[PDB]
Amino acid sequence: VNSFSGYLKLTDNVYIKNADIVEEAKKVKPTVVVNAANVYLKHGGGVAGALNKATNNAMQVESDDYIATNGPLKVGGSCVLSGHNLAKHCLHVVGPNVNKGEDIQLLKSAYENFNQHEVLLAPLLSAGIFGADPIHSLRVCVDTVRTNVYLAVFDKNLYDKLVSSFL
Ligand SMILES: *c1cc(C(C)(C)C)cc(O)c1O
């Protein structure tokens, strides 16, 4: 049993809810919250900007130190850092950004990072301002992630479309 409430069960291991991931993290304090990161860990907008704002910029300060030491992530790669006030850990995962012309085949590689964690609160990778089709992102998630993933979908209209169209 875990603390996640109000989710619709899509598969054995994938659950979905219309929720603000920031507000969900603050309530649950999951072991792992996933950030929709870029390779520079520049948390300007989208899910990353919202998560970072909720940490009072402490996520960005920590991220800048990481990049200064390690250099940029790979597209499809991830980095576990602090979860600050939101979670124990934040798994920063880089999905391909279609609005930068990145290979959508890298979305499966991105989701494979989730398999290193038994339970996660996450957004749909490469959705929103990363430009991919969220229906596609949900299909790759279900077909890739084997650990237990609780997906937060901010937009109610999109949530209802994801559920209604789910095979
Ligand atoms: C973030 C990222 C990484 C790798 C997997 C080396 C990119 C390591 C690490 O300790 C971290 O915090």
- Site to substitute for ligand 1 among 38, 73, 80, 91, most atoms within 8 A of C-beta: 80
**Between β-strands 78-82 and 119-122, what pairing exists: parallel, antiparallel or unpaired?**
unpaired
What lies within 8 Å, CB to CB, of 101 at 6+ separation is none
How much distance in Å is there from the Cα of 79 to the middle of ligand 1? 4
C-beta 39 within 6 A of ligand 1: no
**Between β-strands 78-82 and 89-93, what pairing exists: parallel, antiparallel or unpaired?**
antiparallel
Q: Which of 117, 46, 49 is nearest to 63 (CA)?
A: 49
C-beta 80 within 6 A of ligand 1: yes
How much distance in Å is there from the Cα of 159 to the middle of ligand 1? 32
C-beta 67 within 6 A of ligand 1: no
What is the 3 state secondary structure string of the chain? CCCCCCCEECCCCEEEEECCHHHHHHHHCCCEEEEECCCCCCCCCHHHHHHHHHCCCHHHHHHHHHHHHHCCCCCCCEEEEECCCCCCEEEEECCCCHHHCCCCCHHHHHHHHHHHCCEEEECCCCCHHHCCCHHHHHHHHHHHCCCEEEEEECCHHHHHHHHHCCC
Nearest CA to ligand 1 atom 5: 79
Breaks (C-N over 2.5 A) in the chain follow: none
CA atoms within 13 A on the CB side of 61: 7
Q: What's the full length of the chain, in residues?
A: 167
Q: Which atom of ligand 1 is nearest to the CA of 73?
A: 7
Task: Report how far apart the first and last C-alpha atoms of the chain are (Å, whole number).
Answer: 26
Distance CA 120, CA 130 (A): 20
C-beta 79 within 6 A of ligand 1: yes
How much distance in Å is there from the Cα of 117 to the middle of ligand 1? 14
